[PDB]
């Protein structure tokens, strides 16, 4: 019912270490996120970079999510028949990189970070399905 | 009971130049394909490379479809919650490349080749959607 | 072509008739299986199906290609659904057949099952195609 | 993650006054259900009546869910392409009847009771969708 339950739904199958529902329109802030993760720290400026008119800048300079440096693998956020972005965190102190997927609905963004080893396709479709569901709703 | 029916409905929105339904189990061959395209010439050996246990050999050496040299962008064919593969044809003398998507249903493979400029995400969800429809209709 | 979707619905063999009919601007049969009553669905009949009056057809019934029918369940505009469970009427010594309507964006998927084919089978058949057309 | 979360998923959109996930095979009992409702009281005997070989007895004598007398509107639990039952409670002390839908997955039953005025179609598809989802998993 609440947005936290939507995060619960995303975290249910166990392949995500974190999940979040983030507004990108007139309620541009984190609606709900996994407690204690980095998504709780996603800023309005970071959201702008994700949904911005410029779809080439993030490929050159990357982007941050909750101040976590990431790289863009594929941008399909505004392409025909899709509404996703495949991202991957940058490895720091020997840590493994993590896949991230964004699903864009009409008012919010579905963001998921996979646990170590989880494939981008799994996250892509997870993000896609909830985005589509929110769109009909 | 015609699979040529499905390829027609894949060619509707006009973003594809080719479309095909290809088996990868008992009926390892093209069931239906765009007339005049390379998908029409997909050999059993090629189907094997697509659905094989080896999910690294094609990234290293690429794969072919109807003999056309291609590269694998992403493999999500057997990964949790997905059933697609993002492919892209290679250029010989500067000609435009074309994105390709594979959608794995029960015993059938949905394969679509986009026109110039059509994004992989578009084709990925195009193949994904038809595969999902086929799976749900067990 | 829409005639591709109707011949698609005839694949599994549980149906004796299938059709794609418009209910908005293009209010007429787009495609139908040849030799059946569905080819003859009129705009007046499409109006009853998709009408604002969701009680009229229960009291007096409805017709598809002039075939007299009774509405079992109306889920066309209800939340989470987009179907209608119909059943043709017997005009004497004839077996009845179930019919299901699936409402997509601007189209209407209509399927008539053969004798013995249960309504739930047809309901999900229409539901699945309507869902595919919607998501796509 | 747990079973109560699946119940939470079913209750999210607000059209259900109650929801539950009930095992019908080797773990034939309520796995999770809405706190304080009637589904919490679903017995193994009631479960057997729902999934039993006899698909006609319940139309004649009705059936109970948590001791609550109900009637069967439609049985599609084992028909081709479907996996649901459309049930409806019987009105007692002037109260309104409530629609109920049962969706059958491989090992469990998705059961939902609509609020006053909620249509059978809504519950039918809600139950159908989660049962199909559970099936993709088991």
From Swiss-Prot, chain A:
Keyword list, A-Z: Acetylation, Actin-binding, Cytoplasm, Cytoskeleton
InterPro entries in the cross-refs: PFN (IPR048278), PFN_euk (IPR005455), PFN_sf (IPR036140), Profilin1/2/3_vertebrate (IPR005454), Profilin_CS (IPR027310)
Cellular component annotations (GO), alphabetically ordered: cytoplasm; cytoskeleton; extracellular exosome; glutamatergic synapse; postsynapse; presynapse; Schaffer collateral - CA1 synapse
Molecular function via GO: actin binding; actin monomer binding; ATP hydrolysis activity; phosphatidylinositol-4,5-bisphosphate binding
Any GO BP: negative regulation of epithelial cell migration
One of the Pfam families matching this protein, by short name: Profilin
Superkingdom of origin organism: Eukaryota
N-acetylalanine modified-residue sites: 1
Tissue: Highly expressed in brain, skeletal muscle and kidney and less strongly in heart, placenta, lung and liver.
Family matches, as CDD domains: PROF
Subcellular location: Cytoplasm, Cytoskeleton
Family recorded in the similarity comment: Belongs to the profilin family.
Subunit note: Occurs in many kinds of cells as a complex with monomeric actin in a 1:1 ratio. Interacts with PFN2.
Protein name: Profilin-2
Originating organism: Homo sapiens (Human)
Gene that specifies this protein: PFN2
UniProtKB/Swiss-Prot annotation, chains B, D:
Subcellular location: Cytoplasm, Cytoskeleton
Gene Ontology BP annotations: modification of postsynaptic actin cytoskeleton; negative regulation of actin filament polymerization; negative regulation of epithelial cell migration; negative regulation of ruffle assembly; positive regulation of actin filament bundle assembly; positive regulation of actin filament polymerization; positive regulation of ATP-dependent activity; positive regulation of peptidyl-serine phosphorylation
Modified sites of kind N-acetylalanine: 1
Pfam families: Profilin
Keywords, alphabetical: Acetylation, Actin-binding, Cytoplasm, Cytoskeleton
Family named by the database record: Belongs to the profilin family.
Name of the protein described by the UniProt record: Profilin-2
The organism of origin for this protein: Homo sapiens
Upper taxonomic lineage: Eukaryota, Metazoa, Chordata, Craniata, Vertebrata
Encoding gene (name): PFN2
């Amino acid at each position: 019912a609440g947005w936290q339950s939507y995060v619960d739904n995303l975290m249910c199958d166990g392949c995500c270490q974190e999940a979040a529902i983030v507004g990108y329109c007139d309620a541009k802030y984190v609606w709900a996120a996994t407690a204690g993760g980095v998504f709780q720290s996603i800023t309005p400026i970071e959201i702008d970079m994700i949904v911005g008119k410029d779809r080439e800048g993030f490929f050159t300079n990357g982007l941050t999510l909750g101040a976590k440096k990431c790289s863009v693998i594929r941008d399909s956020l505004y392409v025909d028949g899709d509404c996703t972005m495949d991202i991957r965190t940058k490895s720091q102190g020997g840590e493994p990189t993590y896949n991230v997927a964004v699903g864009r609905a009409g008012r919010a963004l579905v963001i998921v970070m996979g646990k170590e080893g989880v494939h981008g396709g799994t996250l892509n479709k997870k993000a896609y399905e909830l985005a589509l569901y929110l769109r009909r709703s």
